[PDB]
């Protein structure tokens, strides 16, 4: 009898066949397109897509004008609109089934930094996320898996404690300036 | 020097250990042909010895030794 949670869940489920050539082709294209780290990054978004599609099928098995069905459908459409994958005019529970892993990976903060263009490459954007140069709503985001909301999309910029922004220069710049001033006198 | 009987050697050896635990060591001499036991604690300043067997003293000598080892570790 101790006071703790013991609540956890695997966010990814491995496929049944380990060496499918077309599956490795599609996952390798996804990683090479959107700048990912491993196959687990594909599989966890695939399993969240599996959660959303299972909820969608469970709603479509329900009858029309059911209150639980209407509430859960409106809540899931609100969640899809606020994550910004599904459009605000397209929102209907029949259009959830026609949604794709590419459109889920488009809302990555790494991909959104690459689309806004403050970083050169996708992996260079991931380097900037790792090295803590950018912030979202006066909050430094260190992890590239941040699902950027549509309302919080426009607030992506460089952080204040950043040499690329308005801050102090880095260790290499300080060391080169100190070496130059020591060589000059 | 030769604190015999009992509790004189124990208090004196605990004083020797609490003076300095680093330079102090304890030696234990067992004899079976004559059959007696000897404890001597030194701290490289004075040496204090205890020379009796009396059967019952074996348990308290090993408890004192295990207490010294626990004070060396802790």
């Amino acid at each position: 009898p101790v006071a703790r949670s013991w609540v956890c869940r695997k966010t990814y489920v491995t496929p049944r066949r380990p060496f499918e050539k077309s599956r490795l082709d599609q996952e390798l294209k996804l990683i090479g397109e959107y700048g990912l780290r491993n196959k687990r990054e594909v599989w966890r978004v695939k399993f969240t897509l599996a959660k959303i599609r299972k909820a969608a099928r469970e709603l479509l098995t329900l009858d029309e004008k059911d209150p639980r069905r209407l509430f859960e459908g409106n809540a899931l459409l609100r969640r899809l609109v606020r994550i910004g994958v599904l459009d605000e005019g397209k929102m209907k529970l029949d259009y959830i089934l026609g949604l794709k892993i590419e459109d889920f990976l488009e809302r990555r903060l790494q991909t959104q930094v690459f689309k806004l263009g403050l970083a050169k490459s996708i992996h260079h954007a991931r380097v900037l996320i790792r090295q803590r140069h950018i912030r979202v709503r006066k909050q430094v985001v260190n992890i590239p898996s941040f699902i950027v909301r549509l309302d919080s999309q426009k607030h992506i910029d460089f952080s204040l404690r950043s040499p690329y922004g308005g801050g102090r220069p880095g260790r290499v710049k300080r060391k080169n300036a100190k070496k130059g001033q020591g060589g000059a006198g | 020097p030769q604190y015999q009987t009992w509790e004189e050697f124990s208090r004196a050896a605990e004083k020797l250990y609490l003076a300095d635990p680093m330079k102090a060591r304890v030696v234990l001499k067992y004899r079976h042909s004559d059959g007696n036991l000897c404890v001597k604690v030194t701290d490289d300043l004075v040496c204090l010895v205890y020379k009796t067997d009396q059967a019952q003293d074996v348990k308290k000598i090993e408890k004192f030794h295990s207490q010294l080892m626990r004070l060396m570790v802790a």
Partner: protein
Amino acid sequence: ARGPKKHLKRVAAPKHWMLDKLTGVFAPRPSTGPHKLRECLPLIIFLRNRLKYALTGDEVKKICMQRFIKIDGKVRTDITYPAGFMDVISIDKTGENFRLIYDTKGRFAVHRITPEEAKYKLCKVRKIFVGTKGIPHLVTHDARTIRYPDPLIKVNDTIQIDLETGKITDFIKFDTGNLCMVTGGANLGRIGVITNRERHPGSFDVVHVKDANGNSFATRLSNIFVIGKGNKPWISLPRGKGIRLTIAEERDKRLAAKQSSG
């Protein structure tokens, strides 16, 4: 077990206390008193978890031992005193009188009242006992044994007692058309008028209660408390007024008010 239980687990605590899971292993087990185990709410939870006046149980003990908390006209010095339904907690220095009425949900609500309302409270009687010399006795839900009552007061009625003298002023008889607070179960917190009474021999009786918005519902009489005649209550009611509107309408009343506030 070889005897009575004194501890209560945090998981084994009831749901309406809304105690959190991570902070503690044990829950504050209420002391014995005028209310049951799962019907009341303790003074330490009412003071620390809901009002947020104190941080710790030691601070709650300091508050109850400075002689500040006045429950229904008497100072209780216990942190685990069972404060149940229609209990009046008075705090003199802040000048705050609280009446423990349920909210529209299953939880109790922090309900501010006037001292004119805190002077009295309402209690449902459970049985009439004939004492040792032919003396009628009412047994209320908060264990008050009042003697020589009005003989029109029956088994399923309510009485408006006074806190200063412990005697009855008025009474509400269990009749059709009267209001109804539902004290227990899945309909805990509903307020509506009584539209039907169905008797059963052996099995327990049931009452159909109609909401003001037309939402009729059945409830057994063990969890039923009338609060006044007709559609006019004698107490003050919290916000929500005991309706239990749907979750979609709750989402609407949250979201539209949030977007209107900005």
